[PDB]
Ligand binder design. Structure first.
Ligand SMILES: Cc1cc2nc3c(=O)[nH]c(=O)nc-3n(C[C@H](O)[C@H](O)[C@H](O)COP(=O)(O)OP(=O)(O)OC[C@H]3O[C@@H](n4cnc5c(N)ncnc54)[C@H](O)[C@@H]3O)c2cc1C
Ligand SMILES: NC(=O)c1ccc[n+]([C@@H]2O[C@H](COP(=O)([O-])OP(=O)(O)OC[C@H]3O[C@@H](n4cnc5c(N)ncnc54)[C@H](OP(=O)(O)O)[C@@H]3O)[C@@H](O)[C@H]2O)c1
Ligand SMILES: [Mg+2]
Length: 309
């Protein structure tokens, strides 16, 4: 059944923690584990990082941690590095169900010369490689937590939640879905529909697929799961199979759900939002609806939740 979690006093706060730790005095957390999430055919490594904050930096699902990688700011000598934000991929109880760890889902930013393909480690992303290079016992400077856009609306435990992720944008939704389905949270018994759409390059690039597939078998009446494998599938128009093409495959169901009050979440590449808007406008147009008016109503009704980068 659902996994026992502790401490239940993490449910007591009425407001999300915010900026508990700030950049000039971060919390020195400790790495528990780092593991690759992806297989050899993935275009790049995405790693899962479990971070022991000891209960000192609690958060709510949908929030981000800040990480200050070591070193000095290049554009400000003697200054610390800037914060990088990472959507937390764990529930508030974390992957050890004890309120002491949080997890990040981090893609290594690797530079390749556009013409030679030559790598240049000096142009690699500092924090993402710092994180995926981390080992148990290493220290991580944490700030935050931060973010309210992606907090899970729990007022209606039978709400519908349509989650659209690309790549590491899956992070908040791993947290949502563990709280909805995996953890024994007496004060949040989810009985609605959670529908995850996940776009990744190929099968080897899938993130937490075994976990999400397990929800299909455990909660078949409350969870749906669709993947867009961009380098293994192509869309109706011939472009690579992207999440927007998967949304289009279910557009009548999705619009009906939205009309019924469903929340819809977008997390991942900022570049996916224009193609999603184009798809939704085309879908609306075929239904004889104005997408612009629909989106205005969704935003007014606080059904529309976007965090992309
Ligand atoms: C709210 C929020 C949540 C986020 N959640 C996540 C998440 O869950 N997972 C995740 O992986 N990311 C997430 N991101 C992105 C993350 O914050 C970082 O921006 C990302 O990890 C890259 O930071 P970095 O320190 O590795 O790269 P930086 O060192 O900041 O470099 C940025 C980019 O510039 C490139 N670059 C550096 N120098 C050069 C050069 N000389 N020429 C050309 N290119 C260069 C790097 O290769 C890299 O791609 C999130 C962003 C936001 C705003
Ligand atoms: N809270 C946040 O804001 C937050 C949280 C987590 C992640 N992020 C951001 O999310 C991004 C995730 O990048 P990643 O490296 O994990 O993913 P990625 O591998 O670059 O892309 C993931 C999938 O999205 C596809 N894709 C590319 N362009 C697209 C488009 N216009 N529309 C739809 N799909 C498209 C890719 O296909 P192809 O590569 O085959 O084209 C791939 O299949 C990062 O930029 C990160 O900063 C933001
Ligand atoms: Mg895999």
């Amino acid at each position: 059944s659902k996994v026992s979690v502790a401490p239940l006093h993490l449910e007591s706060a009425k407001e999300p923690p915010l900026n508990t730790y700030k950049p000039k005095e971060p919390f020195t957390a400790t790495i528990v584990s780092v593991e690759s999430l992806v297989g050899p055919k993935a275009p790049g490594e995405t790693c899962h990082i479990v971070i022991d904050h000891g209960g000192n930096v609690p958060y709510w699902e949908g929030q981000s941690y800040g990480v200050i990688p070591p070193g000095e700011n290049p554009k400000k000598p003697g200054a610390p590095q800037n914060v990088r934000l990472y959507s937390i991929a764990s529930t508030r109880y974390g992957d050890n169900f004890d309120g002491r760890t949080g997890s990040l889902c981090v893609r290594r930013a690797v530079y390749y010369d556009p013409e030679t393909g030559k790598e240049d480690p000096s142009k690699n992303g500092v924090c993402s490689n710092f994180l995926c290079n981390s080992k148990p016992g290493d220290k991580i400077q944490l700030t935050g937590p931060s973010g309210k856009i992606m907090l899970l609306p729990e007022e209606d435990p039978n709400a519908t939640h349509i989650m659209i992720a690309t790549g590491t944008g899956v992070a908040p939704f791993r947290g949502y879905l563990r709280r909805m389905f995996m953890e024994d949270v007496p004060n949040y018994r989810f009985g609605g529909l959670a529908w995850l759409f996940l776009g990744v390059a190929n099968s080897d690039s899938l993130l937490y697929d075994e976990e999400f597939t397990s929800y299909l078998k455990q909660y078949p009446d409350n969870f749906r799961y669709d993947k867009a494998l961009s380098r293994e599938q192509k869309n109706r128009s011939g472009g690579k199979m992207y999440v927007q093409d998967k949304i289009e495959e279910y557009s009548d169901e999705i619009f009906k759900l939205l009309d019924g009050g469903a929340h819809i979440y977008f997390c991942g590449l900022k570049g996916m939002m224009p193609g999603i808007q184009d798809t939704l406008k085309k879908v609306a147009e075929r239904r004889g609806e104005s997408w612009d008016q629909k989106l205005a109503q969704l935003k007014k009704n606080k059904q529309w939740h976007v965090e992309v980068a």
